[PDB]
Write a protein that binds this ligand. Structure first.
Ligand SMILES: *[C]C1=C([C])[C]=[C@@]23C(=[C]1)N([C][C]([O])[C]([O])[C]([O])[C]OP([O])(=O)OP([O])(=O)O[C][C]1O[C](N4[C]=NC5=C4N=[C]N=C5[N])[C]([O])[C]1[O])C1=NC(=O)[N]C(=O)C1=N2C3#C[C]N([C])[C][C][C]OC1=[C][C]=C(Cl)[C]=C1Cl
Length: 445
């Protein structure tokens, strides 16, 4: 019942906070809505797959927080095999290699150059302060692309870059925000690696699980927080089943839209009440297709494909075979408006649709005979809102966004949507948690 801090939510962010706080001898309790920790990271384990991340999986270099943490937790990593030739799919046929129009590629990298130069103006700690904030916030990321790119290849190809990175549609997202977003990953280069990718040996879900190991029964599953009352020195916290917990500080560690569902006494300041209200989550279905053999490797196909076809389920693919070569698999995201559209469908109908995409992208009959299939659809995510992260619609960043990680009395704000480096990724979840934890620490001693 009685603790120094309560952490709302036990994804990587809430758990990171909790662990640091624990390192300093602070009494922490974690209330977590689900019957598992890990949130948007989730490793399904079953005899068909051994294990598989249906959520966040990939960590890059430069991402030292989650690397240091996982390493401490005793979790190894492995290099995602980007073995052979990448395949792009455009306008029916398919092309193997780099990106093939001159003037259009001169357009290509000019766009990524511009996006970065534009990045320079935007303070990562406060994008709302950018000299050109207003112009850029009013502006949709689609019009920006159009205003910059002279050709429709670049333009089209860019839309899909936006799709892949923020699971959303260009017309729906603030230019300011997107430009910030990329910048805060180290810019165009880093974010989307032409490209040392890694996954955790055994699942990214381990990061959370192992911290729950450290915390024991101070992590409470099936405890969705519904009220936070702050009005009297001791903070009373209520969960769905009308259990009560009291503590001296709170750390909100759940995404904006979800924070909005909690009842706050006193109310959150009007400004913030609006912000958290207006950042929608993105939309993805993550899909692992399993095959008896790694047939794509055999045709010198990497197994990673960038698909920019109108009516094709999957938009981007990666090989996902185990580090030793057992249980060959192809991981694909079906995302943004495609996710919304195909979410309706039965799992089995997606599986067939997907298989025949692969058949004709890979020109192989064996793509039609999967051995097993796993997917989580994150749109339909009650305790997540969606993946990978929250986006900013136009004008929102500057109307309310300033207040994005500011305390209210004794309530502090974590969650990857509040990081200033790799916001939206597992890395960002850590940065957030830890930052929030330290904030609480200063509010002590
Ligand atoms: C879902 C997802 C997917 C599908 C995918 C992915 C992802 C995801 N991602 C993202 C991540 O995951 C995120 O960011 C994170 O995780 C976040 O975290 P946090 O902050 O913590 O949050 P969460 O998890 O959610 O947690 C929370 C918690 O809480 C709870 N709750 C709620 N409510 C409540 C509660 N409690 C109490 N009470 C109440 N009230 C919940 O339940 C939870 O638990 C990712 N990430 C990373 O990092 N990585 C990755 O991968 C990922 N994934 C995405 C995608 C990405 N991309 C694409 C990029 C990368 C790259 O890729 C590539 C490259 C190259 C080529 Cl060629 C290809 C490709 Cl694909």
């Amino acid at each position: 019942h009685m603790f120094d801090v309560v952490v709302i939510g036990g994804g990587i962010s809430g758990l990171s906070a909790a662990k640091l706080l624990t390192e300093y001898g602070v009494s922490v309790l974690v209330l977590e809505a689900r019957d598992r920790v890990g949130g948007r990271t989730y490793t399904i384990r079953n005899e068909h797959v051994d294990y598989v991340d249906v959520g966040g999986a990939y960590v890059g270099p430069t991402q030292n927080r989650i690397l240091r943490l996982s390493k401490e937790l005793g979790i190894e990593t492995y290099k995602v095999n980007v073995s052979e030739r990448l395949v792009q799919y455009v306008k029916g046929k398919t092309y193997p290699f780099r990106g093939w129009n001159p003037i259009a590629y001169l357009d290509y990298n000019n766009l990524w150059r511009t996006i970065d130069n534009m990045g320079k103006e935007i303070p990562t700690d406060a994008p709302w302060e950018a000299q050109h904030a207003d112009k850029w916030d009013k502006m949709t990321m689609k019009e920006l692309i159009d205003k910059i790119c002279w050709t429709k290849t670049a333009r089209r190809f860019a839309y899909l870059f936006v799709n892949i990175n923020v699971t959303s549609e260009p017309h729906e997202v603030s230019a300011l925000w997107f430009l910030w977003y990329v910048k805060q990953c180290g810019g165009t280069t880093r974010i989307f690696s032409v490209g040392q990718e890694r996954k955790f040996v055994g699942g990214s879900g381990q990061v959370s699980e192992r911290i729950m190991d450290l915390l024991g029964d101070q992590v409470k599953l099936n405890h969705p927080v519904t009220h936070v009352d702050q009005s009297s020195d001791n903070i009373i916290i209520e969960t769905l089943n009308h259990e009560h917990y009291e503590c001296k500080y709170v750390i909100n560690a759940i995404p904006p839209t979800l924070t909005a569902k909690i009842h706050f006494r006193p109310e959150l300041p009007a400004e913030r009440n609006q912000l958290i209200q207006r950042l929608p989550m993105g939309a993805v279905i993550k899909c692992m297709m399993y095959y008896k053999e790694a047939f794509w490797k055999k045709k010198d196909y990497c197994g990673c494909m960038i698909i920019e076809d109108e009516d094709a389920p999957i938009s981007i693919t990666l090989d996902d075979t185990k580090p030793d070569g057992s249980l060959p698999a192809i991981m694909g995201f079906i995302l943004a408006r495609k996710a919304d559209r195909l979410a309706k469908l039965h799992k089995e109908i997606r599986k067939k649709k997907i298989c025949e995409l692969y058949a004709k992208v890979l020109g192989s009959q064996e793509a039609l005979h999967p051995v097993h299939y796993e997917e989580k659809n994150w749109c339909e995510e009650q305790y997540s809102g969606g993946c990978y992260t929250a986006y900013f619609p136009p004008g929102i960043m500057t109307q309310y966004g300033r207040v994005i990680r500011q305390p209210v009395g004794r309530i502090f704000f974590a969650g990857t949507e509040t990081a200033t480096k790799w916001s939206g990724y597992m890395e960002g979840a850590v940065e957030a948690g830890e930052r929030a934890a330290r904030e609480v620490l200063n509010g002590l001693g």
